[PDB]
Amino acid sequence: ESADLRALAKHLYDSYIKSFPLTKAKARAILTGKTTSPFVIYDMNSLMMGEDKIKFEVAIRIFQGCQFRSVEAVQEITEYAKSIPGFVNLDLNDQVTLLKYGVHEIIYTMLASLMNKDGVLISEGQGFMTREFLKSLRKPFGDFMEPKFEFAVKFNALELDDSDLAIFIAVIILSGDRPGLLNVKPIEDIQDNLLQALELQLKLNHPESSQLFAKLLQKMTDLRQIVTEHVQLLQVIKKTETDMSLHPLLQEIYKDLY
C-alpha cells in the first residue's frame, strides 16, 4: 500500500509538470530574484506600455486579461484532471460536474504559487502586477484581487511544494460533495485514495510540519468562500457595466453553479 501510494504521488507530479507551464518552483525563483526580470505593472502607464508583454479604460483591460488567462487555466486543469487515475473512467456527466465546481478552487490554489504580498506574476512569469495597483481600480474591479492575496499569504506559509500541490488539487476536484453527482461512491473511492497519498506525501516531504495535513484541509473550505465572493462580484459586473460579457467557457462554468 505504501509503495502504491507513492507511485500515485509520482504519477500526479509528472502529469502536473506536463499540464501547467508555470510551476510553483519556477514562480518562487522569479519572485525571490534567485534566477537569471518581469515587466512591473503598477499604473495605467506601465499597463498601456507593458501590453506588448501581456499574453492576451484601465479596469476593463485587466478584466479582459484575466478572462483570457482564466480560459487557458481551465483547459490546463482539465488536462490534468483527465490524467487522475480512475477519473476518465467515471461517467462523462460526473466528469463535467467535478470540473465545473473544482476549476476555480484550483485556479485560486495555483494563483497563490505566483503571488507574494506585493503582487502576482502574469503572462507565464513575464510580467508582475502589483497588489496596490489591483486594489486602486474603480469599484467593483478593485476588490476582485485582494481576497486572493490575503489567502495566498496565509496559504504560502504552509510552504507546500509542486509535488504536494499536485495531489492536493487532485483531492479538490475528486470531491463527492458537489451538487448534481449521479454516482458518488466511485468518486469518494478515488478521493479517499487521493487523501491517503496526500497524507503520506506530507509526512515524507515535511517531517517537521506534524499536522500539515490537518492545516491543509482547513484551507480547502476557504477556497469555496473565495469562489462565492468572486461569483457575487461577477454578478455586479453583469449589472453595473452592461458592456461586459463572460467568455462562453466561463459562462458554462457559472451557468447553474451552486
Binding site: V74, L92, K100, E252
Partner: peptide, 9 residues
C-alpha cells in the same frame, strides 16, 4: 457543452 468537448479531446 464546452466542458464535454475538453473532456472528450
Amino acid at each position: 457543452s464546452l466542458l464535454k468537448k475538453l473532456l472528450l479531446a
